[PDB]
Amino acid sequence: GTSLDLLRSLPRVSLANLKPSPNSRKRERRPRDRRRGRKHSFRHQYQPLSLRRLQYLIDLGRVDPTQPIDLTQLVNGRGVTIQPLKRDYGVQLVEEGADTFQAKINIEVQLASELAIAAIEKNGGVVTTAFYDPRSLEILCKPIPFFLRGQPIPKRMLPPESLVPYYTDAKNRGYLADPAKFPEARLELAMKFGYVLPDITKDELFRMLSARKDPRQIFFGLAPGWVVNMADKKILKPTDENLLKYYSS
Amino acid sequence: KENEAVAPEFTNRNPRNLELLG
């Protein structure tokens, strides 16, 4: 960098020496002289995520592979942009990267593609779908603010009757799906591609991957109706019997 | 054996080669 050698020789700069960059400011016309003289809402706005991006996120180590994929973690990793003002209601998956994304991990997405589900399951990953209320999901993305408000964790909502069939569908692998069909369903997906189905139970971390929260439960770690001692870095659980009845209600 | 070498493609020039073959 010979430019630095120029700087050392040159004299000390002063305030007056400052000069605007070339073409930074355009000229203007003034009237002093003759120059200027004379003269859809119902449909959920699902937000997609590319598997190639998922491979990019996984390959770059942006999201910990050991931890199961969590939408909140993706928000913490700035993977996708969700705006409550946009009234985003859903999150979905993408079939892109089907041939360049060879990895297995547990994940939960509001919406999943049938083709993508088998491919990740073929690698050995676990995919499920859960329903988050758009208002509740906004709280999920930003848990700290409601702690500042002092609000307690509410019970997770359930889908409207329009979307119940999708979540209840076994092939969709929703939390409302019948677990009894899953062993049969997984074989059918394996048969469709024809790949040898790897049993999840064989995995050493099977329990960690298969862990799922209650439908009422917003958070894997935290049960609904809980409170957090943010000041003391602790978790507070209600001890009132009526509160338990309220949660049951 | 050097004789074993054979060209990849034939060079048949008979006008009726295809006609007789069908």
Partner: protein, 110 residues
């Protein structure tokens, strides 16, 4: 932003590969972006002029221009039309040639 994790085999299954080690001893060094990506961006201006820009140019910019001109002259069929902003340390080239340049940069080891 977490630094990329060490991988047993490169290139990564996605296709990302960290800068080659040892780095080239050329007069000009090209640093990677904050996201550890090659600082090459496809750009279009005036709705008709395709462009590609290199940002993180370090060292002798003139040496890089000569090599870039030499590399792109055969493929383009003539000396490339380029604009050099030395103050910003950036190079402007008409047309879209990111793939060839990106591959060529990998050959340099950047």
């Amino acid at each position: 932003i977490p630094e990329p994790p060490k991988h047993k085999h490169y290139p990564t299954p996605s296709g990302w590969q960290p800068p080659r080690d040892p780095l080239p001893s050329l007069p000009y060094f090209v640093r990677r972006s904050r996201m550890h990506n090659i600082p090459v961006y496809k750009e279009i201006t005036h709705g008709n002029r395709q462009m590609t820009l290199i940002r993180k140019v370090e060292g002798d910019i003139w040496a890089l221009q000569k090599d870039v001109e030499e590399f792109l002259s055969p493929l383009l069929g003539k000396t490339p039309i380029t604009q050099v902003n030395e103050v910003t340390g950036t190079l402007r080239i008409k047309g879209y040639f990111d793939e060839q340049l990106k591959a060529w940069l990998l050959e340099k080891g950047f």
